[model samples]
Structures are given as C-alpha cells and as structure tokens.
Target: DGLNGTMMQYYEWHLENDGQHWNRLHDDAAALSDAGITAIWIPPAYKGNSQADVGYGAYDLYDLGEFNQKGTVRTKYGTKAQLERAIGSLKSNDINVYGDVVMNHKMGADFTEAVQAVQVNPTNRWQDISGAYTIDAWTGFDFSGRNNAYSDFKWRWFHFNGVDWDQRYQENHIFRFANTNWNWRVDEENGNYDYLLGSNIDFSHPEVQDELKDWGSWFTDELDLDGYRLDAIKHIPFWYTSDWVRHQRNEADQDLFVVGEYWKDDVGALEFYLDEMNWEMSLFDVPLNYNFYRASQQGGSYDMRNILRGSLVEAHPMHAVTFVDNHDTQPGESLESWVADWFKPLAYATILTREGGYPNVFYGDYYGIPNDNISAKKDMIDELLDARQNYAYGTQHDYFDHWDVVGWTREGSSSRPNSGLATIMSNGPGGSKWMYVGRQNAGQTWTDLTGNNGASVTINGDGWGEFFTNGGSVSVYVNQ
Candidate 1:
C-alpha cells in the first residue's frame, strides 16, 4: 500500500546553506531514503520578489533561477540546473517530489497602470470606504528580465481585478477594479476573502482562467512534478483550482497527488473546501496543528482526549496531511505556534505510528534550527519513521480514556514480518495504560522503542499489557 510512506517538508525560512539547497537536497537524498522518507515537499522553485522571497511573493514562475529576473541570477536556493539534478536524484532514490505552487496573487509588477478603483476597508473588504477614483495600481507585469522565454503572457491592469495598494494615493486599502465584484463561493472571511496581497488575479475572466490553466500544464511538465502543494487556496476560486488540478491529473494520466494549504484553523472550513475540491486533493490539517499547539502550551492541564477532536485527521483521515510544524509556524514568522520541545516526541508519535493521514516531518525539527535555539528531534523522529515503515501495520486500537495519557495498539501483520506497533503518550506527569496488544501477539514481549522507559511488558492471552511512559513524554512499545 502507499500508506506507509513518510513525507518531509524539506526547507525552512532561514536556510543557512543558501544558494545551493537543491544540490544539498540532492546530496541528502540517499540519507533521507535510508531514513525511511518516501515523499519530500520542496520550497517554491521560482524567482520570488527577491532572492530571499521564500517562494511566497511569487514574481516570475517561469524563472526558476534559470533566467535572470528580480535583479537576481539564481534563486535563494540554487540555479535551475542544480534543481533538476536534485529532483532526478531524489526520484532515483524512490521518493515522490511535490513542488509549492503560489497562485493566489502576483507581486513585483514591472509597471503601474492608472485604473478607476474604490478603496474598501482593509479589515472589511466588503465595505467600501471611498468613492471611485483613478489610482495608479502596480498591475503591469512585463517579464523584461526573461524576455518572454517561455510564454508571451503580458499581464496588465485588465488582467487583475484588484490590488492591495494605490501608488497614486500612497494609501493601503483593498482596491477593487471598476465593474468587478469579489468572486462568489470563496471563504466568507473579512466579508470577502477574494482580495489578498498584491495584484489579485480575477478568475472570473475567461482569459485569466485560460492563462492560469496554461501555467499549470506548463508547470507540471516543466519539472515533471509528482504533485503540488497549493498556496493560499482559500483566496482562489474553488472551481478554477479544481479544474486546474483535474487538468494536471488528466495531462499526466496519473493520480498526481496534490495538497492545498487552506491556512484556516477551522476543521469545518477545511472540510468545506475539501468537499468543493471534491476529494481531488488532500489538505494540511491546520486545526490539528492548533490542537497540538494548545496541548503543548497548556501541558498537563490540557485534556489529552481532545487532542484529535474536531480535526481533519479525526473527521476526514484519508485526506488529511497531518503535520506538527512548518516554515510559517517557526519563530518570528506568521502563525508562530511551535509545539514545545518537550511535547515534540509525543506529537510526532501520534502522527507517525498510526493509521490514516499522511504524516509530514518538519525539516527544522529533524535538523536543528540552532539559530532559533530549537534542538533537533532527529533521533526520535528516525525511530518513528522506522516504526511506520516496518511495524506500523495491522488492526489499530485507539485509547483516549484519560485526560493526561492515551495509548493505541496495532496487531502485527502476517504479510510484513513482526509488523506491529504500540503507541503510548502523555501530556501530563508519568502514567501507564492497560492497552490490548492483540490475540495474534498474545505471548509476545514488547519494549518501548522511544527509550523513554527501559521496562518491557509481555501480553497475556487476552493481549493485555500495561504500557509505561515518562512524565510529559511518549513511548512506543514495539515487539523485541
């Protein structure tokens, strides 16, 4: 099954080994594969507003550090050649590569366009604060740097329906173009969530839709991508993205795995988008991350039973990309809700040694983010990855009977030799649980793989054993 694969978010904001991440990732491919990583999600592989754009403020999608643009010859990573080499190397090591796609808006316009616009309240986009007036909006994008190497898609004020600022007035407000309305059926946030940062692309325009569709087709074939991690999905029109995703899958003639970053902390909103996306792609479980965030902060005072409540993993498991932290959640960044160091192991074990939801290991956590005083959880994560690949199999038994400690069991599988895993974790002081191993492993002995405890337990005929864990820690008992 494709279920046992571990995924890695292979980049952080403050990457020390700059201008060579592609080659660096290529070099680390063998080590990652050896450590049981099956899929890797790389950063946005295009020229951003600058060399240090971090892939969000996308300027030129075609650049990819190949053609000179944005006053930079190579991306913050490396040149295009090195990126290709890295992708090829990772594929050779039997890993799936997913690229980040930022299609929500465009930035770093080449020219300004005088257009009739009305300023709406920044907080409430639905409420207009000013009358219609001509303003200079930076909506002209001529890729003079690339000289239209790939496509001659000239972007102008007509191409975009709104912008976040007006150069003429020198004021920051949600400026909507003349005779345009916010796209319908978007996330009903800020009254209208359609207008985000920069020049907002109007999906209602057939030409704009066609242009984005063309970009998607080109992007899929350009890198020969296995799939994509879509950015700011809530801001984009639902139908347009669905069509683009379907087009990519059709063009590839394969189930091109795609996951969208909706960036909402509500499971209800995530599920709503997934329904509109029609299960064509998976979504990162933001609500689950928040749940973990609260648990880590509150510690023993937090109820362990509510950790998975109202989360995507609990509601729609198969389509949830369960993650602990990502680049955006790191310190000094937006959505900075880093799980505490002590709770890292328990949080990781919950995601890894379990069924349902594809788990993503943060590169920052695996490798130390020493600049921010974050220690590496490499040793613990490596053990979990090994368990996922080799022993996290068979029937699962969940135990959420306590406020501080919880446990689950997986009966060993016959097809995969000795493939059984037991996961016990606590957000409070030290405790134990009488979790049932399984009738198949009735007399087998097991020990904590996490090494939080040194004791071992033997399952009785009823497959019952008391699993132990240290205070504020987790222990995975695997068959010895």
Candidate 2:
C-alpha cells in the first residue's frame, strides 16, 4: 500500500436483506479486493424488528440472528454464521470491517412498566408541558429466546432515562424520568438534544454502563472486528461514550478505529464534541457532506474554492472520516441531502486524490441504487480508487485560485515507481491550470487517469504543466 487510505460504505437504501447480505459480501470478496477497498463500513448485523429490520430498530443486541428471537432466526442481513463468514472473507482479502453500532435506543420491548414522568417539549427539552403522570413504558427486555445464552442481563425501564411513547395513554410525547437527568455537554439543540428515539438508554446509570461494556467485549471477541461505525453518538452521553471507547480499546489492546455519526452540519459543534471526548474518536465529516450537497445542487454558481470550508476534513483532517452519501442521506430518508449524481465525479476526485481525511465511497454511488434510479458510479470510482492505491502520493501542491476551477498535485514518492499526481476540477466552465507536479517528474509524461482528458501533458524541466477538466468535472493527471 504505497498510497493513501480508502474505504467503502458497503450498503445502500432498500438493500434486499433476504438473509443473504453476508453471503453476498463473501461472494463479492474478489471484486472488492480488486477495487482496493481497504475497509468496508458494513450495515448493522444484529437482530432488528424482523427479517426486514435494516439493523436500526434494534431488539436484541446479543442476538446476531443465532436464536429464534425478533420473530425470526436470521436478521435482515443474514445469520450469525454468515456474518462471521463475511468478516472472514473481507479480512482474508486485506479489507478491514467496520460494523455499524446503533446503541442510542432499543425497540420491540417484551413488557411494559408503569413509570412516573413529565412531558417535555421536543423542540425544547427543558420545558415541561405536563405534570408527572404514571405512563406505561415498554422497557422490559427479558430475552427468553436465547435463555441467557451470552449474558443474563435483562433490560427494564430503570435502565433507560426516557421514552417517547406511553402505552397507558396511547400518546407520543417526550418524557424525561423524574430521577434521571439529561446528559450534560451534549449538542445545545432543543435546549438539550439528548433523547432521540425509542427507549433512550440512561448512560448515567452505572449498571447500564457496565452492561454495555460487557456487551462490547463480547462483540469484540465474537467478531474480532477491526473498528466500529458508532451510530447516533450525539444522543449518547459524551463521557460514557469516551470511556466506553477507551475501555474497548484497552480490551482489544490496540487503537481500534472508531468513527461516530454526530449527524450535524455545524463544524463548531462537531469540533466541540471532539474536544469533549478528548479526541478519543474521529467523526463523519458532516459539514463537508453538506458542502458537497450544496455544490451538487448549486452547480456553476457554487464557489468551488469554498468546498472544504467549515468542514472537519479541512480543519481537523486526521480526526475526520469523509463521505458523500450514506443510508440516511439516500432518497426519501429523513436526512436526505444527497450529492447530486452529476457532481459525483467531482466530489469523488476531491476526496480520493487529496491527502487528508480517510475517504469513504458510498455503496449507492459505487454500485448503483437501482431501486431509486441512481446510476452506478463504478467506472469513475474504479479509476479514482486505482489512482489512490497506485499513484496519488507525495508532497502536495494546491491551486485553489479560481471560483470554479481548482487543482492540486502530489510530487510522487521514491517508494512507488511513478506515484505523483496532478488533479484539476471545474464546477462552471472547463479550463486548464498550470500546476507544478515536482521536479522529480520533470521530464515525465502524465496522463489523465480519470480519462476526463484523453490528452497527456509532458512535465517541463520546471515540473509545471497545464491540467484540464471538462466544465463541472474533474481530471487527475498522473505520470504515465
């Protein structure tokens, strides 16, 4: 690996999970190996609401479809055996696996318990709209299916801080337990943006923390996972989350790659959270994604120079995991701000050919979301991936001089035969910019690896050459 790192978000919206997704991963090992996907952020592989659970509506955390729980033996993705096999296949091909860990809340409770709580405004968590009422909340989770196979720890209302529904009243409202307090130092949205959905686990409780830690250790031993894609971390208590991460890392005896989904486009808030967590984990570049979304929609009018502005990748590159789209951002999803298809190449080039944050290619973009009319970006992504794995390296030179035309160059590394690259992109009109690739490649001829420009440029004695891109497109010129 003489090149930069690259990963793939290996799932999409409407991915048919007929207990074959893991097997499918095993089947596609060769292709992913050839594509040079260093890691894959796989979808959650737990027992959801049924065979249809996208692994989000989590029911049993311990069950990976091994037991006859959640009305089925296999999760939507596949059975436990299949999942282990899939991870084995991926690891065998030198591809690390990142499992989606959705621990913000729990769903499909086995029993309900009467609890006294007050109604708090969803927009403002501090405002109590109603007095204490005895509401029946479904928090009892005695997993009778497995009969205490992994761990006998059961879940109950006391384990959570709040709930959004009341079975006694048949109503939906934000309710914060009278004894439990909202986690501090969280996002300042709605006065306190703590409770998200379902039964929000009260991380303040010591027992809850211990159980989660126990589960984490079990999961680590079970999967031998390389990393985790933490889901809805903003809702999780910052201190507990950090402690849990530290605990897991200690248990694993290595810095297990952890990236949380903060799910906010505000750079300041994200940075603050990182600071609060003591920089224990990296976060998905939310602000950068919004930038890509805006540029994709704004077209020629969008300032290409400001693309990386107000982004984690720009401000704190080492603590960022950058991507263009994911499950929640797909069409019809709650957080859909898809980077338009027309600008995908430009977006991919911006991340892949650059030297900064770890870039992730969305499965929908790479393999095509056929159910939603998204075309496959396989060809363009392959070209960029190949460039990153083989050619994009060395000292970088950025040329962000124009409103719509900008480019950069990698001066090549001695370790890799011909590893330098010069990248150019335009959001408005096609143009050429003279960039210096490095004196090492002075007499070298470079070709546009993207194929956006079929013509090749010969680096002058001064290591400068004009790189071109079609309007609203990108071109990566690498030494031929």
Candidate 3:
C-alpha cells in the first residue's frame, strides 16, 4: 500500500497484426503485476478500418472482433472472448485495465452519401473557401457485418459535421457539412481542431451524443474496465468529454481512474482543460515528455536545474500522468519525439523516484520496438520498479542546483523498512552531492542500486551522505 503506483501503455504502434496480442497480454498479466505495473492502458479493441488497423480508424464502435467486418472476423487484438479473457487476467492479477477510447472521429464508413457541404480553409476551419455544394462523403456506417447484434444504431452523414474527401466531386478538401459548424471549445490549433481525421463526429448532436453515451456504458460493462484512456480529447469538445466520462462513472457507479490524451506541450492549455472539465480526469504530462525529449536531444547543454520548470507534474502533480514516451512518440510515428536511449534511465529515474505525478511506463521502452529494431530496457526499468515498490517514499528533498548534475532524496519510512533513497544523475560528467536521507539513517550504509556508481556511502551523524553518479547516467542509492 505504501508502494508507488505505476501504469504502462501495454501496446505499441508497431505490434504485429497476428491477432495474438490479447493472448500475449493474458499470459503476461502476472509478470506485469510482479513488475509493479498497477495499471495497463490497452489499445483500442473495437473494429477499425481493417484487421490491420491500429484501432484508431474507428469503423464500428459496437463490434469488438465479434463481427466479420472490414473483411476480417477479428480486430488486430483478437475476438471479443479473447479480449474479455485478457481483461480478466489483468484484473485477477490486481492490475487495473484502461481501454483506449477513440471518439473524436470515425473512419471507413460502409457507404457514401451525397451530403451538401462547403469547403473550408484547411488552416482555418472557420473560413469558408467554397459555397455549399452536394458532395458524396463516406459518412454512412450501416454495420452490416454485425447485423445490429449489439445495437440497431447506424451512423449517417447527419451524425457527423465534417469530412475531408468528396467522392462525387473526386476531390479532397475540408468540407464542413451545410448548416453545421465545427464544435466549439476545442483546441485552438488550426483555428479549430474539432476536425482531426476522417468523418469528425458531431458531439453537439443529441442523437450522436446519446449513441456515444450508450456505447460507453455498453463497452465498459462488456470489458468490465477499471478506467479509460480517452483518445484525442483535445480534438473533442471539452464539455462532451466531461459529460461522457461523468456519465460512464454514473452508469458504472465506480470512480473510474480516467486519463486523457490532451497532446499539448503547453501546460496552460492543460490547466485550462482540467478547469473546464472540472478535473474529470488526469492528463498525460505532455510538457514533461517534451522536456525529456529536449533534454535527451540536447544532453549536457540542457540545464538540469530547469528540467521541471514548466511541466504539468510540477504544477499539478495529482492531475498529471507522467510518461517518458508512448505509441505516438515512438520512432517514425506522427508525433515522433523519442527520448534518446542514453537519457531514458535519467527520465525514468526522475518520474519514478519523485513524489509527483502518476508515472506511466511505455511498453515499447520496456519490451523494445521490434519493428524499429529498438532494444528493450527491461533490466533498467525492472530495477527502477523494484526501487519504487520497496523504497522511494517519505519526504522528498530535491537538489536541482547544479547545471550538469541533479539529485533528490526520499527519507526512509518507518512502515516500509529501508524505504528511503537518494537518486543522483548527470547529463555531463559524474559528480557527487551531499544529500540527507534522515538522521535515523545515520551509521547505515547505502549502495547504489542501479550499479551506475560502485561507491558506497555511509550516512553521517548529521544525516547527510555524499551520493555519487556515473557520467551520463542515474544512480539510486538505497540502504544496504
């Protein structure tokens, strides 16, 4: 109970399309729990554009590999039964499961509709570039494969507000549906970011909202999920996100630990969103992630003292879900800002040891991105997890004075024996810092658990010890 809770984004973007992912997750449940991952953020399980879809395509919301849709009987993950079993396995191991929910837009409609629409400026959605015209848009989702197994709901052009391609005109343009406007209260990027990709859902529509709400309850009940990883929240209307999440919690009668992907480096925008939604859920610490990316790229040139200068975790720790990298940040992805391999240890150390945000470990970093030939950092992460579970407790004392070196100390807790640690790291040359681990630790020997530093330090009578770190690495010193 005294241990720090950690979440892992269980699936990466480059995972195989063999449909064995759920089986793999089911098998690895116990080991993941043992590794101190308290929660797992599973990828979207619903049917996407095709079997190979990464779950973001969002073809059929009700079909979770239960229907032969998009020329496949199963989603990339597996059948509905397999998904339930995987969720059961994770829950049985006392690990919470967070299903990824992509509600911002839908792709791969079953048919095209000749809907009246006007082309809008791609850069500024508010500016109309062309007059109203009849353009065939792929805004019809009949779900013929499922045959209305779960619900007899079919999506049409009226259920959405915008589409990019017009088949009738054989042209590509940002077409806003006639007599409709982009949803307000979305990201200001691109004038209005309500339209991200595919047919953007009309959250403002009463029927559309009702259908999505119904799906939320159905999906949550079907999966028995502990929480949700809300996808593309910045693109979705803020009020709808607040309403949808609250509605789900009300339906489940459980305080689900929901987190949103607001995908903005500006902490102010995140704060505004949290306030607008009345803090309905935590958000990914995008600023901190960007900070890590920049620090990793700049190395010693990045001032270690300003690492947490403008991070969400620094401003609102409890509302921030910290992560080093995720599927989008992986190599060759859209938001590819991968943290350098060398600085990964330091980044993990900062998030894991600090008593700030809920740290999230990336599956790609833990297991390696096989498709990209990236090696796993399992050993290093495991060691850090061990420290987080057994140590990394009590009051924290941050030492961010140095430009090249920084350190922090957690005073040991009486409840957890040897539950204190001194974390020292350097982007430049190795150095030492005289930090306090509490007077109770006096006369006790501490060793670097990371083994990045071989030197041992004995607590002085005054509760201070000189901790050392290796060059371009992190060292976690714990009681020997």
Candidate 4:
C-alpha cells in the first residue's frame, strides 16, 4: 500500500493449453504480491472458439468453463471453479485481479441463419461490392449445452451487424447485413473499420446493448473482480465502450480500475480515445512501446531525449498504462515488435523509476517466453521493482539533453524511509550524467542498485551527483 503500484500481464502468447494456469496463479499469488505487483491482468476467462483458443474467439460469454460448449468444458486456462479459487487466492494476498474483457465479437456460433446481406470490400468496409442477397451466416448462438443456466439469452443474425463467412456459398468475403450500417465512430484504418473478425456485435441494437450491459454487471459481480482490461477496444464503438465502462462502475458501486487495449501506434489516436471516454480509463501506452522498439533497433542513433516524446504517458500520464511488450508483441505473434533483449533492462528502469504512467511488467519478460527460447529477466526486473517500491517517490528532475545518455533523479520524500534515487542510462558507451538529487541528500553516498556501474558516488554539498551507466545499459543509484 505504501509502494508504487505495478501491474503484470500474467499470461503470454504460446502458453501451453494445459489448463493449469489458474492453479499456477493461485500458488504464486502471495509471491507475486510480495514482489510488489499490485495488480495481475489475467487472460480472458470465458470459453472461446475451442479449448485451445486464447480467449479472443468469444464463443460463449456466459460459459466460464461451467458449460460443455466449444467442444470442451474448460477454456484454455482452467475450469470455472479453479478460476474462482485463483481469484480468492489473489484477493487473500491483497492483489488486484483485472479480467480481460473481450467484447468486440463472438466466434464458433452454434448454428447458421440465412439473412439478407451484402458483400463489402475487405479493404474498404463501407463500400458494398454486391447487391443484397440471402446468405447463410453463422450468427446464431443457442447455448443448448448451458440449458439457459445463468442467462437464457439466445443470439441470432439480428444481434450482429457483420459476418465474414457464408455457409451456403462457401464464401469468405466480409459481409454486412442489409439495412445495418457499420458503427461510425471507429478506427478509420480500412474505411469504416467497425467489422473486425467473426460476427461483429451490433452495438446499435437495443437488445444487443442490453445483453452486453447485463453480462458486464453479472460478470463483475460473479467474479468479484477489482478491475478490467478492456481488450480490442479499437474494434468496438467508442461511445459504447464509454457507456459500458460507466455502467460497470455504477453497477459495481466501486471505483473499478479499467484499462483499454486500444492498439494504435499514433499518440493522437490514444489521446482522442481518452477524451472520448472522458478519461474514465487508462489506455496501454502503445506509442511508448513503439519508441522502445525503435530505440532498441536503432541503438545509439536513436535520440534518448525523444524517448517519451509524442507518447500517451507524456501527455496523459494519469490515463496511461505503460508496458514494454505483451502477448501480442512477443516473437511470432501478430504484433511482433519484441524489444531487443539487451535494451530490456533499460526499458524496465525507464518505466519503473519514472513518476508518470502506471508501469506494467510483461509475463514473458518476467518468466521467459519458453516458445521463443527467451530467458527470464526476473533478477533485473526484481531489482528495478525493489527500486520502484523503495526509492521511486517524490519530485523528479530530468536530464534529457544528451543524445546517447539521459538521466533523472527522484528527490526522495520523507514519507518513505530511504527514498530518493538517481537513474542514468546510455545507449552508447558508458558515461555519466550530473543530476540533482536534492540538497537534503548532500554528503550521502549512493551506489548503483543495478550493479551496472560499481563505483559509488558521494553527493556534493549542492545535492548533486554524477551517475554512471555501462555501455548500452542503465544504472539506478540509491542510498548506500
């Protein structure tokens, strides 16, 4: 409670579909909390297209391993009972659990329905390439396996606005239902990009909207979740998300922390979304992650001064959830922009030590991505986490003038004993940056917590010290 909060994405892409994730999380709950992870953003809990589906397919929203849908009783993670037990363990350890909310579309429908539809251009969704014709679309989802246990709501063609497949014609063209228009307020990437994959949810439909809202209410209460990680909001309507988040907070009667995965590289798009939501939730700092990727690739040529330039965290720190990489960015993933291993420590220190956006630690980075043969950076990350929890407090002073080397200092607050730290990082050769650590810290000896630079530097009478970093590395200097 007295430390800086850090959220860890608890799952990574290519995780084995062994259905033991819940058990693992339950066992590691106390250890994770002790490591200063305030919140754990778990993967999608509901059943997807299949037992192997990574929860994005959204077959049955109501089925959390409780029903025999999707050819299996459990999702890729675990059974519903195991999930609740894991949540209980996390709660017992005082760790917040944020469920990944996938509301864009549903897949693996139980049946097909012949509906009047028009084929739309794949590149340009608004342009109808064909006249209205009756086509069999997989838009019906009657969860007979569930027997209407939790909610007897059956889905139909009218419940969705778009589908990608037609069973009768054996066609795979993006088809939009007749008399239904794609949601206008969406990304303008492919010309009215409302329709993503599968049967896109018709947010304009009254019944559809009501059902989604009701599910949100029930889901929050049923899981006893403390927060939500809104997945794929870029595909969903902005206005609908705003309304949904508002409804969730109101129904819960608590300040539930919500962060949306609006995967856009443009900082302007992120800012616009934040404004549209009225700053109701934090967004993943995609632009900052791109910056890290670029810096890692370009090496010393990339300007360290512009690391945070044109990023969401720079403009709207309070509404930014910063991360270096995630499941999508891991190697071989769709958004595979994995940062170079060498620059990972630098990236971690940059986000953890800074007093801006809330930092998130990726599971792949912490535990290692076994599929990619990546080693865990647990030791380095743990040290940085310790620095974050102990010394990352009070006013910050930045030294962003250098091209290859940049540094900052935290004028530690008395509220936290032994607080305050000086951080220096370089993309080139080892160098030093003279930064202010506050006059109160004068004469105090400081050593590099990262062990990148072993030499200790005594703060001058003016409360300033020259912090050093190794070649293409970071050094966080704290009280010796």
Candidate that would win on lDDT:
3
User: After superposing candidate 3, which stretches have Cα over 4 Å from the reference?
Assistant: none
lDDT tens readout by residue for model 2, 1-480 = 454778898888788867888898998887887887888888878887677888888988899989998789998888899999988998888888887898788998988999989999999998899998899998999887899999999999988879999999799999998767887657778998889888988887888899999898788779988889999998888888898888898898645899999999998889989998888789999999999999988889988889999989999999999999998999898899998878889888888888999999999998899888889999999999988888888899999899999999999888988888998989998999999888778888899987888878999998888888889888898876
> TM-score of the candidate numbered 4?
0.98
lDDT value, residue 230 of candidate 1: 92
TM-scores, each model vs. reference: 0.98, 0.98, 0.98, 0.98
Model 2 stretches with alpha carbons more than 4 Å out:
1-3
Q: What is the C-alpha RMSD of each candidate to the true structure, in Å?
A: 1.3, 1.1, 1.0, 1.1
**Counted clashes in each candidate structure:** 0, 0, 0, 0
Model 3 Cα lDDT, one tens digit per residue, 155-181: 899989999899997989999999998
Instruction: Report every candidate's CA lDDT.
Output: 0.88, 0.88, 0.92, 0.91
Instruction: Give a tens-digit lDDT track for model 4, residues 1-480.
Output: 466899999999888999999999999999888887889999989999999998888988899988888789988899999999999999999888898999999999988999999999899998999999999999888887999887989889898889998999898989999999898589888898899899998899878888999999999999998899998899899999999999888889756999999998999998888889999999999999999999999998898999999889999999999999998999998998999889988899988999999999999999999898999999999999988988999899999999899999899998887799999999988788789999999999999888988879999999988888878999899994
RMSD of model 1 against the true structure = 1.3
- On the 0 to 100 scale, the lDDT of residue 262 in model 1 is 91
